[PDB]
Design a protein around this ligand. Sequence first.
Ligand SMILES: CC(C)[C@H](NC(=O)[C@H](C)NC(=O)OCc1ccccc1)C(=O)N[C@@H](Cc1ccccc1)[C@@H](O)[C@H](O)[C@H](Cc1ccccc1)NC(=O)[C@@H](NC(=O)[C@H](C)NC(=O)OCc1ccccc1)C(C)C
Lengths: 99, 99
Amino acid sequence: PQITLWKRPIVTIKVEGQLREALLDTGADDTVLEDINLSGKWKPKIIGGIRGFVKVKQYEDILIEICGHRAVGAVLVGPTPANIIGRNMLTQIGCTLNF
Amino acid sequence: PQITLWKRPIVTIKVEGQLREALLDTGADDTVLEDINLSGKWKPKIIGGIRGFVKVKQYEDILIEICGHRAVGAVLVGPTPANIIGRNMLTQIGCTLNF
Ligand SMILES: CC(C)[C@H](NC(=O)[C@H](C)NC(=O)OCc1ccccc1)C(=O)N[C@@H](Cc1ccccc1)[C@@H](O)[C@H](O)[C@H](Cc1ccccc1)NC(=O)[C@@H](NC(=O)[C@H](C)NC(=O)OCc1ccccc1)C(C)C
């Protein structure tokens, strides 16, 4: 679809039988999922933001179903305020900025 | 133009005779400019991110020339790692997410 930016570009995602709402975020390298247990093993990682750095679990090969389009990727899981779909996921659903 | 998200969607902006590079950031409500003095008066404001909340100077009616398209807006100025063009500015250059 074509999402205008008058409101936050939140979309439905489906990660392992769990529906969430994630924000499509062009200013995020990575995808960060807020406090939702993912089956599988992970490796420790730290993303930085505005202000600080949070500790996250990185999971590889996670399947995320984003607004009707699937995409497998590294997914970071950690105490972030929102689900963030970063460019790593956004390139796979073929998402572009447009003006 | 059409910016794919394989790399950070950084673009040229012109803010008061100053060229900067800003990231077009769909996950930012506001626009945040990194440590570059803006003529004019401001009001105190605080944006939150990943981890924490930075103090910024909000300036109204700031003219930002974004990748060939102008846009006047509230611009927040404060110790952020990057210039971030938030949705507030991104709606005016007619920028949409596209997949
Ligand atoms: C999701 C992250 C992986 C993302 N980080 C990255 O992409 C960075 C560059 N990559 C990275 O960290 O790489 C890993 C690494 C590790 C070690 C060494 C080197 C590298 C990120 O948080 N980046 C953010 C800022 C940034 C930019 C450049 C460099 C570093 C950080 C925004 O782009 C991102 O879009 C966030 C999304 C977000 C929203 C809400 C909560 C948490 C995260 N927006 C923001 O932080 C913006 N805030 C907002 O939009 C808030 C929500 N609105 C607001 O403040 O309005 C008033 C308000 C006040 C109080 C409550 C509610 C509203 C900010 C730019 C102004």
